[PDB]
Structures are given as C-alpha cells and as structure tokens.
Amino acid sequence: MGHHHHHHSHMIRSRKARAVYPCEAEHSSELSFEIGAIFEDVQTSREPGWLEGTLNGKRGLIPQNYVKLL
C-alpha cells in the first residue's frame, strides 16, 4: 500500500469535503455539523445547491457553500 486513491485526474465519486461554515440544520435529512467536519463520498444532490455525503455514519443534505472539497 503506497498509492492514494484520491488523485487530481479523478474527483468523480469518493470525494472529501471539510465544513468551512457550521450547519445547524432543523430537518432529519439535513446533516448538522460544525467547522472541520470531514464528509466521505461527497456527491451532488437532487436538491439545488445541496450535496450528499457521509458524516459519523450518516448521509444527508449538506450545504455546498458550507463545505470545501479537499
């Protein structure tokens, strides 16, 4: 194991995002989080300007503006 799957030539699926703004969400589907929170497999949602990615073992609505793809 001496190779990283996360290359610059490949960013479709398997994405990471670091929350740069906190999302204190009110609905179950929406992920609540603070600054620093990393998300696994961040992809585009069907909701406009929202993303779906895994946080603490749960996927849901993440504000795209509140996160920055690593």
Curated annotation (Swiss-Prot):
Tissue: High levels of expression in heart and skeletal muscle.
Domain of life, source organism: Eukaryota
PTM characteristics: Phosphorylated. Phosphorylated in vitro by constitutive active PKN3.
Residue ranges annotated for the SH3 domain, each copy included: 12-70
Subcellular localization, as worded in the UniProt entry: Cytoplasm; Cytoplasm, Perinuclear region; Cell membrane; Endosome membrane
Function: GTPase-activating protein that catalyzes the conversion of active GTP-bound Rho GTPases to their inactive GDP-bound form, thus suppressing various Rho GTPase-mediated cellular processes. Also converts Cdc42 to an inactive GDP-bound state. Essential for PTKB2 regulation of cytoskeletal organization via Rho family GTPases. Inhibits PAK2 proteolytic fragment PAK-2p34 kinase activity and changes its localization from the nucleus to the perinuclear region. Stabilizes PAK-2p34 thereby increasing stimulation of cell death.
Domain notes for this protein: The BAR domain is important to associate RAB8A (or RAB8B) and RAB10 to endosomal membrane to promote tubule extension. The BAR domain is also important to recruit WDR44 to endosomal tubules.
Subunit structure: Interacts with PKN3. Interacts with caspase-activated PAK2 proteolytic fragment PAK-2p34; the interaction does not affect GRAF2/ARHGAP10 GTPase activation activity towards RHOA and CDC42. Interacts via its SH3 domain with PTK2/FAK1. Interacts with PTK2B/PYK2; the interaction negatively regulates GRAF2/ARHGAP10 GTPase-activating activity. Interacts with MICAL1 and WDR44; complex formation might transit from GRAF2/ARHGAP10-MICAL1 to GRAF2/ARHGAP10-WDR44 complexes.
UniProt name for this protein: Rho GTPase-activating protein 10
Origin species: Homo sapiens
Gene name tied to this protein: ARHGAP10
